[PDB]
Swiss-Prot record, chain A:
Plays an essential role in viral RNA transcription and replication by forming the heterotrimeric polymerase complex together with PB1 and PB2 subunits. The complex transcribes viral mRNAs by using a unique mechanism called cap-snatching. It consists in the hijacking and cleavage of host capped pre-mRNAs. These short capped RNAs are then used as primers for viral mRNAs. The PB2 subunit is responsible for the binding of the 5' cap of cellular pre-mRNAs which are subsequently cleaved after 10-13 nucleotides by the PA subunit that carries the endonuclease activity. Influenza RNA polymerase is composed of three subunits: PB1, PB2 and PA. Interacts (via C-terminus) with PB1 (via N-terminus). It is found in: Host cytoplasm; Host nucleus. Belongs to the influenza viruses PA family. Phosphorylated on serines and threonines by host kinases, including human casein kinase II. This is Polymerase acidic protein. The lineage of its organism: Viruses, Riboviria, Orthornavirae, Negarnaviricota, Polyploviricotina. The gene is PA. Coiled coil: none annotated.
Swiss-Prot record, chain B:
The gene is PA. The lineage of its organism: Viruses, Riboviria, Orthornavirae, Negarnaviricota, Polyploviricotina. Plays an essential role in viral RNA transcription and replication by forming the heterotrimeric polymerase complex together with PB1 and PB2 subunits. The complex transcribes viral mRNAs by using a unique mechanism called cap-snatching. It consists in the hijacking and cleavage of host capped pre-mRNAs. These short capped RNAs are then used as primers for viral mRNAs. The PB2 subunit is responsible for the binding of the 5' cap of cellular pre-mRNAs which are subsequently cleaved after 10-13 nucleotides by the PA subunit that carries the endonuclease activity. The chain holds residues 620 to 668 of 716 of the full protein. It comes from Influenza A virus (strain A/Northern Territory/60/1968 H3N2) (Influenza A virus (strain NT60)). Belongs to the influenza viruses PA family. It is found in: Host cytoplasm; Host nucleus. Influenza RNA polymerase is composed of three subunits: PB1, PB2 and PA. Interacts (via C-terminus) with PB1 (via N-terminus). Phosphorylated on serines and threonines by host kinases, including human casein kinase II. This is Polymerase acidic protein.
Swiss-Prot record, chains C, D:
Transmembrane segments: none annotated. GO terms for biological process: exit of virus from host cell nucleus through nuclear pore. GO terms for cellular component: host cell nucleus; virion component. HAMAP family: INFV_NEP. Interacts with protein M1. May interact with host nucleoporin RAB/HRB and exportin XPO1/CRM1. Belongs to the influenza viruses NEP family. A motif (Nuclear export signal) lies at residues 8-17, 81-90. It is found in: Virion; Host nucleus. This is Nuclear export protein. InterPro entries: Flu_NS2. Gene3D superfamilies: 1.10.287.230, S15/NS1, RNA-binding (1.10.287.10). The lineage of its organism: Viruses, Riboviria, Orthornavirae, Negarnaviricota, Polyploviricotina. Mediates the nuclear export of encapsidated genomic RNAs (ribonucleoproteins, RNPs). Acts as an adapter between viral RNPs complexes and the nuclear export machinery of the cell. Possesses no intrinsic RNA-binding activity, but includes a C-terminal M1-binding domain. This domain is believed to allow recognition of RNPs bound to the protein M1. Keywords: Host nucleus, Host-virus interaction, Transport, Virion.
C-alpha cells in the first residue's frame, strides 16, 4: 500500500494491476492561499524471491 | 548532444551527461531481463558496423 | 506553478518552429492571457486582509469617543459648580480660561466625531 | 491653543501644591488625560487613512470572471480532443501536463472567487 497524489483514470492503461482508493485531502502550503488536492492510495499484491 | 526535440537536436553540459548515465544504470538495475542483454549485444555489433 | 507555466510554454514553443498551425498560436496566447489574469488576481485577493484590519482598528475610537464626551460634560459641570462659590481672583481667572478652553475642545471633538463616520 | 494648555496646567499646579483637595487632583488627572488624548489625535491627524488605494481598479475587474469561465472549458475540451487525436510522444506528454496544470488553476481560481465574495 503506497501513498500518492496523482489522479488515476487520466492515464488508466498504465495502472492495470492496482486498486486505487481516495483516502483524504492534503493542504499544500504555498506563497498565497490554500490548494487542497485530494490524496490517493495504491494497493497491489506481489511476491518476489 | 544528450537529448532530442522536434525540429533539431539539443545540447547539454557534463552534469547532464553524468546524471543521465547514473539514471541509465539505475534503470538497468530496476528492469533486468534477458531481452536487455540480447538487444545490447546485437545493437553493439550494429553500432560497431 | 510558475515553473510549470514556463516549462509548458518552452515545450510548446518548439512545436511551432517545426510545424505550422494557428491553433497552437491561439492556444499559447490564451495560456499567457490566463497566466496574466491569475497573477493579477493574486495581489487583488492578497490585499483583502488589510481592509479588514483597518476596519477592526477603526472600531475602538468609536468607543473611546463616548467616554470622552462623558468626561467632558462631567468636568464642565463640576468646574462650573466650583466657579460658582469661589472668593479669590486667581480662582476666577483660572476658571474663565478653563471654561473657554473646554468649550473649544468639545467643539473640535464633535467636529472630528462627525468627520470620522 | 497649546499655550493655554501649559498656562492652565501651571496655574492649577501652583493652586494645588499650596492646598490640596480630592477634586483638585481629580481635575489635574482628567486634564492630563485629555491633554495626551488631544496630542494623540493630532498625531493621527496628518496620517488619516489611505483612501487612494481603497478606490483602485475594481469596476470592470469584477465582470471578467464569467469571461474567463467562457474559455475555461472551451480550452479544456480542445486539449482533450487534441490529446486524443495526436500520435507523437512529445505532444502527448505536453498535453497531459497542460491538462493537469489547467485543472489545478481552475480549482485555484474558483476557490479564491468563492472565498472573496
Amino acid at each position: 500500500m503506497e501513498f500518492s497524489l496523482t489522479d488515476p483514470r487520466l492515464e488508466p492503461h498504465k495502472w492495470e494491476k492496482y486498486c486505487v482508493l481516495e483516502i483524504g485531502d492534503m493542504l499544500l502550503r504555498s506563497a498565497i492561499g490554500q490548494m487542497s488536492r485530494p490524496m490517493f492510495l495504491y494497493v497491489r499484491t506481489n511476491g518476489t524471491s | 548532444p544528450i537529448g532530442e526535440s522536434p525540429k533539431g537536436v539539443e545540447d547539454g553540459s557534463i552534469g547532464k551527461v553524468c546524471r543521465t548515465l547514473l539514471a541509465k544504470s539505475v534503470f538497468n538495475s530496476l528492469y533486468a531481463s534477458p531481452q536487455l542483454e540480447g538487444f545490447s549485444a546485437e545493437s553493439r555489433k550494429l553500432l560497431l558496423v | 506553478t510558475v515553473s510549470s507555466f514556463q516549462d509548458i510554454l518552452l515545450r510548446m514553443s518548439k512545436m511551432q518552429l517545426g510545424s505550422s498551425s494557428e491553433d497552437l498560436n491561439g492556444m499559447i496566447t490564451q495560456f499567457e492571457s490566463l497566466k496574466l489574469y491569475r497573477d493579477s488576481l493574486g495581489e487583488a485577493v492578497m490585499r483583502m486582509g488589510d481592509l479588514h484590519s483597518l476596519q477592526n482598528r477603526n472600531g475602538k475610537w468609536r468607543e473611546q469617543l463616548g467616554q470622552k464626551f462623558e468626561e467632558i460634560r462631567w468636568l464642565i459641570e463640576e468646574v462650573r459648580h466650583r466657579l460658582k462659590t469661589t472668593e479669590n481672583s486667581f480662582e476666577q481667572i483660572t476658571f474663565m480660561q478653563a471654561l473657554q478652553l473646554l468649550f473649544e475642545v468639545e467643539q473640535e471633538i464633535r467636529t472630528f466625531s462627525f468627520q470620522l463616520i
